[PDB]
């Protein structure tokens, strides 16, 4: 997804 999590 994104850095750490998707929802960025």
- DSSP secondary structure of 1-8: --SSSS--
1-8 in b/e form (b: 16+ CB < 10 A) is: eeeeeeee
Residues recorded for the chain: 8
Query: Which residue is listed with tokens 């960025």?
Result: 8
Take residue 1 and report the two structure tokens written for it. 């997804």
Take residue 6 and report the two structure tokens written for it. 């998707």
Experimental determination approach used? NMR
Radius of gyration of the chain (CA): 4
Residue 6 CA to residue 2 CA, distance in Å, equals: 4
Take residue 3 and report the two structure tokens written for it. 């850095």
């Amino acid at each position: 997804g994104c850095p750490x999590q998707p929802w960025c």
